[PDB]
Amino acid sequence: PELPEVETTRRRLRPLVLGQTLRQVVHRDPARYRNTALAEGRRILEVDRRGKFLLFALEGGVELVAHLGMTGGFRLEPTPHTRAALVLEGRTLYFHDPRRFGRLFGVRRGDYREIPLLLRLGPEPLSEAFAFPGFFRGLKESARPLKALLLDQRLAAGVGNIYADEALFRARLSPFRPARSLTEEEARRLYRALREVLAEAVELGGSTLSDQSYRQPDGLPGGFQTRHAVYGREGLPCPACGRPVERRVVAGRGTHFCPTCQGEGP
Amino acid sequence: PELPEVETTRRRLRPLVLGQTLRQVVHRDPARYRNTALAEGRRILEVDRRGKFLLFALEGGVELVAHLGMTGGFRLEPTPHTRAALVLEGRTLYFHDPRRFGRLFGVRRGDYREIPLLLRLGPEPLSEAFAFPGFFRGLKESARPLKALLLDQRLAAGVGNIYADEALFRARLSPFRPARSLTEEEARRLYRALREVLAEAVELGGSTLSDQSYRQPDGLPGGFQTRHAVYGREGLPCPACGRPVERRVVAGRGTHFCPTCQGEGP
Ligand SMILES: [Zn+2]
Numbered sequence: 001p002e003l004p005e006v007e008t009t010r011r012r013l014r015p016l017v018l019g020q021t022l023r024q025v026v027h028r029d030p031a032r033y034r035n036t037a038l039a040e041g042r043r044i045l046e047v048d049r050r051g052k053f054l055l056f057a058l059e060g061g062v063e064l065v066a067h068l069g070m071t072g073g074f075r076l077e078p079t080p081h082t083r084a085a086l087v088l089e090g091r092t093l094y095f096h097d098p099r100r101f102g103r104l105f106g107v108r109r110g111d112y113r114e115i116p117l118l119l120r121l122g123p124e125p126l127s128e129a130f131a132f133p134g135f136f137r138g139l140k141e142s143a144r145p146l147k148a149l150l151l152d153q154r155l156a157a158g159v160g161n162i163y164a165d166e167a168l169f170r171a172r173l174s175p176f177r178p179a180r181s182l183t184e185e186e187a188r189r190l191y192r193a194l195r196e197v198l199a200e201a202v203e204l205g206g207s208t209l210s211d212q213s214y215r216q217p218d219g220l221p222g223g224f225q226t227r228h229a230v231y232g233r234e235g236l237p238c239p240a241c242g243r244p245v246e247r248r249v250v251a252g253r254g255t256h257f258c259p260t261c262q263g264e265g266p
Numbered sequence: 267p268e269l270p271e272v273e274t275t276r277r278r279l280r281p282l283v284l285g286q287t288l289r290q291v292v293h294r295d296p297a298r299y300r301n302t303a304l305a306e307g308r309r310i311l312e313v314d315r316r317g318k319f320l321l322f323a324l325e326g327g328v329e330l331v332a333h334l335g336m337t338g339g340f341r342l343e344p345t346p347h348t349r350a351a352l353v354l355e356g357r358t359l360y361f362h363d364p365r366r367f368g369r370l371f372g373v374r375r376g377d378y379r380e381i382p383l384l385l386r387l388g389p390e391p392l393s394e395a396f397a398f399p400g401f402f403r404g405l406k407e408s409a410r411p412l413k414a415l416l417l418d419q420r421l422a423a424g425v426g427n428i429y430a431d432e433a434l435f436r437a438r439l440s441p442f443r444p445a446r447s448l449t450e451e452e453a454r455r456l457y458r459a460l461r462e463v464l465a466e467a468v469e470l471g472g473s474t475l476s477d478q479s480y481r482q483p484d485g486l487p488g489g490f491q492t493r494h495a496v497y498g499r500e501g502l503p504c505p506a507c508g509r510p511v512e513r514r515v516v517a518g519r520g521t522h523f524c525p526t527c528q529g530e531g532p
């Protein structure tokens with residue numbers, strides 16, 4: 001679940017939760033679900049998103065921050081691996097998290113000292129805060145692989161494997177070359193590709209694949225998967241040159257790409 | 267402060283905080299003021315008292331429990347020893363506490379796992395629930411000194427040194443005799459005296475001793491100390507027989523009494 005999936009969740013949850021009192025946050029894991037008691041007995045005023053985090057604005061200056069990791073998603077009905085429940089006046093949201101990567105943080109509005117990942121997040125890719133000047137600066141400030149850097153979310157929040165892979169293919173750039181090795185012309189292509197890929201994905205309700213671990217609360221599948229050029233298409237023809245898409249796993253991280261179009265491969 | 271001082275605080279504060287939004291509980295001592303963030307951003311629905319505890323009932327099923335201790339008190343103006351502040355929309359309450367014995371507890375309504383005393387407190391002395399049969403039975407089961415049973419609070423919630431001493435004098439009973447040694451007639455006198463002294467102390471707004479430690483919220487002193495017969499009057503004339511009031515200490519525990527009038531005197 002990346003920015004497009006989480007943004008879709010935010011948009012779909014608003015109609016179902018705005019105005020409702022969050023009666024209780026039921027769970028049995030104070031290590032992963034921190035200070036949730038702070039959020040109880042408060043009316044939900046809004047649902048915001050920062051990166052991949054979901055932030056429920058609660059009456060009285062409090063926020064319930066949700067980290068939807070890599071499985072953790074909210075459902076309208078309980079599941080065998082539901083680890084927490086947000087009990088509202090009219091309905092209940094169940095936190096489906098098979099691999100316990102999810103997190104919840106009851107905090108005073110804006111106080112993210114205990115949420116390091118949220119604290120260092122770069123600007124919102126689809127906002128005016130994500131400007132090319134700063135983007136270019138950040139790239140030249142790093143010698144690490146271009147892909148890896150994008151995943152750190154310091155240059156752009158919410159970017160994961162799917163969209164980094166699709167943006168790199170769109171911009172025709174190797175995911176493995178040094179970030180600072182990019183020319184202004186190239187960096188500009190990636191800047192645009194990243195923004196266009198993310199925007200399109202949001203418009204199509206995100207991507208929905210096989211395992212489909214992550215599901216939207218209404219169960220409506222996304223449609224950006226129909227635009228995937230490389231992600232999840234290993235062995236299939238590159239949509240540009242027909243060459244079989246390659247999937248290389250480096251440092252435990254899998255990356256889809258076309259060796260020909262992205263200047264890599266054997 | 268004992269039941270009378272705490273009750274006076276409750277009565278004085280209610281007209282000032284009822285219906286007000288508790289915006290924040292300001293302090294920098296999480297050791298003594300625990301989970302206060304739980305109470306923030308909630309309207310104050312009531313200010314209850316159980317024994318010597320003050321409880322602010324907050325919208326959303328939360329309670330801010332306050333234990334004053336030896337020198338704790340809420341003031342309408344800040345003091346050199348203010349340890350915390352309850353910032354309301356219309357005003358601010360300051361928790362004055364020179365000796366730092368006071369404590370604050372933010373808790374879900376009813377969850378007194380951290381304040382067990384609050385769960386075992388006996389009936390409220392000035393209530394229909396405080397009955398003689400139970401009181402008498404409670405005394406007949408103890409070989410411990412009468413006064414110790416008045417301080418237990420499982421028998422008489424809210425009673426401390428001042429009112430135990432004063433009740434015992436009014437009832438003309440030895441503070442040091444075994445609780446069980448009392449006859450039913452003696453027990454009935456102590457029962458009545460205890461209730462009258464507390465009721466009277468409440469009427470006069472609590473007791474402001476020599477240390478001038480206790481003061482109502484606005485700063486005005488209580489006025490029951492003028493009715494004191496033996497407390498804080500060691501060496502002064504008993505008001506009934508003119509003999510010098512004595513003060514026996516038991517392991518850091520003073521007890522004022524008239525030897526002659528209260529069946530003692532060696
Ligand atoms: Zn290709």
Ligand SMILES: [Zn+2]
Pocket residue numbers: 504505506507508509524526527528
């Ligand atoms: Zn006397």
